[PDB]
Write a protein that binds this ligand. Structure first.
Ligand code: CA
Ligand code: CA
Ligand code: CA
Ligand code: CA
Length: 465
């Protein structure tokens, strides 16, 4: 093995770095893992398959055009370069190495495809078709779509896309499960809270946020409990950005935002799957939880959970660490069957007013086939009315004492629609024992005299025994 010779590899600071402050990818490459035999697909605005840094790894089997209903995902060219995004992301995962062009992908011997699906009317059906493309050929899908990041919207996948996620993790990859890697959002300026985005807030998506070069939470970041982990992206004008393949056969040094983080995660996950091709979609999430690193990341909300792991709403479990992922993968015992324990918490509706606390001691399906002693994801499915949605903050405390923020104040959100059986998800209690007293807190963070009612609280616990 030799370090890549590509002309912009030194500029790929999140990989080539020798300041400790990187994704630890060289360590995986040096162990011999570069993505061989793994297939990744970018679900976005298309892919420039003839790009000099992509063509060598391009895989028609991983690509389709859902907008035009044909096999060729080539993007449309416009003056504003609207359809540059998929090509940028594809390069992050799998740009060719050692070919004197631009930089390299994290998984530079992986095969890369794209689905052209954003350049047209994006319906539920379009989404489902993209998520379900060739599920026994493609291992890993990477995407960043979701509701407008205006800090006012609550929305997620409709029925067909939800069913495709489920079919994907259930039946995809010969039963091991499609790995759906997701960006958590770019609505930071608008105080958006990513549990209001049902794509990233899903248990089926392995969700990723960003850190700046100097290890800070970028302006565009959204915090939420559903995020699992972090990769580097852009920041302020003194901090470097993402260097990758661009539209028109170019090399950009200015790829930005959380949408640039998901593809780096996708690449790391490809290296990890190469290291253990029998990892299931849940195994992969477990690896990310166990091996991600808080160390060099600055946040004001780091907290240690019931099993001793540091976790943040901006960063999840911290920065992905490819070396550690590959290492743990090689020793990993695949997890037991997923259990789901559904607990109806409320016996009557509760007035919210200025503040509401709901406490309930649960057995987590003790005595039954869905008894859970080792949590993975938890959801609080809430139905409530409120006069000004964004003034609410909502927290969930596990019996072991871990406080998850389910919803932070979203000052721009003046909706009077409340939440209709909305599943807020947290990863922060992973591996805890969910038996005992859970506490739900709903608070009016404004000085306004606000009012509403909580009419349903379903606690949904996932995990093993
Ligand atoms: Ca086409
Ligand atoms: Ca290259
Ligand atoms: Ca958002
Ligand atoms: Ca997710």
């Amino acid at each position: 093995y030799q370090e890549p010779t590509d002309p912009k590899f030194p500029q790929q600071w999140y990989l080539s770095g020798v300041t400790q402050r990187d994704l630890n990818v060289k360590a995986a490459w040096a162990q011999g893992y570069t993505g061989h035999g793994i297939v990744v697909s970018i679900l976005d605005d298309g892919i420039e398959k003839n790009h000099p840094d992509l063509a060598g790894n391009y895989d028609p089997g991983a690509s389709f055009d859902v907008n035009d209903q044909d096999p060729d995902p080539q993007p449309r060219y416009t003056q504003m370069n609207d359809n540059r995004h998929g090509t940028r992301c594809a390069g992050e995962v799998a740009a060719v190495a050692n070919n004197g062009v631009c930089g390299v992908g994290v998984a530079y011997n992986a095969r890369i495809g794209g689905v052209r699906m954003l350049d047209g009317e994006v319906t539920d059906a379009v989404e489902a078709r993209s998520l379900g493309l060739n599920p026994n050929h493609i291992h890993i899908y990477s995407a960043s779509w979701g509701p407008e990041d205006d800090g006012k919207t609550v929305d997620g996948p409709a029925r067909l896309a939800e069913e495709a996620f489920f079919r994907g993790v259930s039946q995809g990859r010969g039963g091991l499960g499609s790995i759906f890697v997701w960006a958590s959002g770019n609505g930071g300026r608008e105080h958006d809270s990513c549990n209001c985005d049902g794509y990233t807030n899903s248990i089926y998506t392995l969700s990723i946020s960003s850190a700046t070069q100097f290890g800070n939470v970028p302006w565009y970041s959204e915090a939420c409990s559903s995020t699992l982990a972090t990769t580097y992206s852009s920041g302020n004008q003194n901090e470097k950005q993402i260097v990758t393949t661009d539209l028109r056969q170019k090399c950009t040094e200015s790829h930005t935002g959380t949408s640039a983080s998901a593809p780096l995660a996708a690449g790391i996950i490809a290296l990890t799957l190469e290291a253990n091709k029998d990892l299931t979609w849940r195994d992969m999430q477990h690896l990310v939880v166990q091996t991600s690193k808080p160390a060099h990341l600055n946040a004001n909300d780091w907290a240690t959970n019931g099993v001793g792991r540091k976790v943040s709403h901006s960063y999840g479990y911290g920065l992905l660490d490819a070396g550690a992922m590959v290492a743990l993968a090689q020793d990993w015992t695949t997890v037991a069957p997923q259990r789901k324990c559904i607990i109806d918490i409320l016996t009557e509706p509760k007035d919210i007013g200025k503040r509401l606390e709901v406490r309930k001691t649960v057995t987590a399906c003790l005595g039954e086939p869905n008894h859970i002693t080792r949590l993975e994801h938890a959801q609080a499915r809430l139905t409530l009315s409120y006069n000004r949605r964004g003034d609410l903050a909502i927290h969930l405390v596990s019996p072991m004492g871990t406080r998850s923020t389910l919803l932070a104040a979203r000052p721009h959100d003046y909706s009077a629609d409340g939440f209709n059986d909305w599943a807020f998800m947290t990863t922060h209690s992973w591996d805890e024992d969910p038996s005992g007293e859970w506490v739900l807190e709903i608070e009016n963070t404004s000085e306004a005299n606000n009012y509403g009612t909580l009419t349903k609280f379903t606690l949904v616990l996932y995990g093993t025994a």
